[PDB]
Design a protein around this nucleic acid. Structure first.
Ligand SMILES: [Mn+2]
Ligand SMILES: [Mn+2]
Ligand SMILES: [Mn+2]
Length: 430
DNA sequence: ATTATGACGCT
DNA sequence: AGCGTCATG
């Protein structure tokens, strides 16, 4: 009735860089621009594993996780850029620095939450109130929203993509009641104006294009961002949620793409996010736990309260390498050499971090995988991180993993190691 | 033999 | 603390 809280109090955007590592490489090498191209890690095994794909190449079926040799079967003219290798491993510094460029631009408009190397949520509620006070009642011109889709429109009583985008936007803007600064649809619209400006600033100042979603919470903003890529933004209003969710597979919503979403589907006998509305909050909590159940109950109605956290920097700084199949580490000298390689990269990144961000890590986490273990991590052990020195860090990691060697020979390592991972955590202002 | 990250929930 | 899940450039 009048006391139902519809979760329309915030304006939240999710900005995601289009095929990010590809764009970084295309900015650096103009010969790659506007071409089918992909970014690969390594090269010897099947041409390298693809981790990013330009939209031109996606049209040929090239995807992330493809081996480049297989991708070349789909797209023989595919161009490839390789991630830098340093100390025997992939080194992603170039992409982390490019990410910082984008994040610093976004931070000029509002508080952001770094959600990945190429995406950030934006809490625009306050910026929207500001812009609405500046608009002094003036209507919102379509010219202010030149790359915005309104999800669900056009509807009701041109066969070109841009024509439909414009028709839907016109329908939306024509319905807009711009006379109260408290309408959630108006607030979302102003949010989209701001996101147009933010995306223009990112492209002007970095060369990088991005997509974005604008809605009332993080989950809807992320979902919205995916609806119209690349180089476009999408507004998902509260009112669009019933129709949008009525045919939305459950796995498309962030956090439901894995085992939990599979159990929602199997236990409840449903397929689409909207079907969740027919269950009581207690029913959902009974199957999926109190937190998940309350979250699902609100989220299938378009409502979620998870805040945009004020955090532009990563909480951990880590280094990892797999040693698959026959290249697993089987001698103590091997394990120690690779721990040193990882620790040297970690030292370099940590020292840069301390200089840039006025903080120091205080905990070192060591994770390994042993051959024949199905898990991603066989074992995790922590120890104190008291100095940014790679030799000490690698000695300490060896000390906390040494008792895993079930070999009679101390020169051999059994069972061989298929993964090493060093992660610095628990940062403190320095 | 996708690999290299990173956040967060659970107990 | 150590383990598992989700995301996935
Ligand atoms: Mn992206
Ligand atoms: Mn992303
Ligand atoms: Mn992606």
């Amino acid at each position: 009735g009048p006391h139902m809280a519809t979760g329309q109090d915030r304006v939240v955007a999710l900005v995601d860089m289009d095929c990010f590592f590809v764009q970084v490489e295309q900015r650096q090498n103009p010969h790659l621009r506007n071409k089918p191209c992909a970014v690969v890690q390594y090269k010897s095994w099947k041409g390298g594993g693809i981790i990013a794909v330009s939209y031109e190449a996606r049209a040929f079926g090239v995807t992330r996780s493809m081996w480049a040799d297989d991708a070349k079967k789909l797209c023989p003219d595919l161009l490839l850029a390789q991630v830098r290798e340093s100390r025997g491993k992939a080194n992603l510094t170039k992409y982390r620095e490019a990410s910082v460029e984008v994040m610093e631009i976004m931070s000029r408009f509002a508080v952001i939450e770094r959600a990945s190397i190429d995406e950030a949520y934006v809490d625009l509620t306050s910026a929207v109130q500001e812009r609405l006070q500046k608009l002094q009642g003036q209507p919102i011109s379509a010219d202010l929203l030149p790359s915005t889709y309104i999800e669900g429109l056009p509807q009701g009583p041109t066969v070109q993509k841009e024509g439909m985008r414009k028709q839907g936007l016109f329908q939306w803007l024509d319905s807009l009641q711009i006379d109260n600064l408290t309408s959630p649809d108006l607030q979302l619209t102003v949010g989209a104006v701001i996101v147009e400006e933010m995306r223009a600033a990112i492209e002007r100042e970095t060369g990088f294009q991005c997509s974005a979603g604008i809605s009332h919470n993080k989950v809807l903003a992320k979902l919205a961002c995916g609806l119209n890529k690349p180089n476009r933004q999408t507004l998902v209003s509260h009112g669009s949620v019933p129709q949008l969710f009525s045919q939305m597979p459950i796995r498309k919503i962030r956090s439901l793409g894995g085992k939990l979403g599979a159990s929602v589907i199997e236990i409840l006998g449903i397929e689409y996010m909207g079907e969740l509305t027919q269950f009581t909050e207690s029913q959902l909590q009974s199957h999926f736990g109190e937190k998940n159940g309350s979250w699902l109950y609100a989220m299938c109605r378009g409502i979620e309260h998870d805040p945009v956290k004020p955090r532009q920097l990563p909480k951990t700084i880590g280094c990892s390498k797999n040693f698959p199949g026959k290249t697993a580490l089987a001698t103590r000298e091997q394990v120690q050499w690779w721990l040193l390689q990882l620790a040297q990269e970690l030292e370099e990144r940590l020292t840069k971090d301390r200089n840039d961000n006025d903080r120091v890590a205080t905990q070192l986490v060591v994770s390994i995988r042993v051959q024949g273990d199905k898990r991603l991590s066989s074992l995790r052990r922590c120890c104190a991180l008291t100095r940014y020195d790679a030799h000490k860090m690698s000695h300490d990691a060896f000390t906390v993993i040494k008792n895993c060697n079930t070999s009679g020979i101390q020169t051999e390592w059994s069972p061989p190691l298929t993964m090493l991972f060093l992660c610095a955590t628990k940062f403190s202002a320095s």
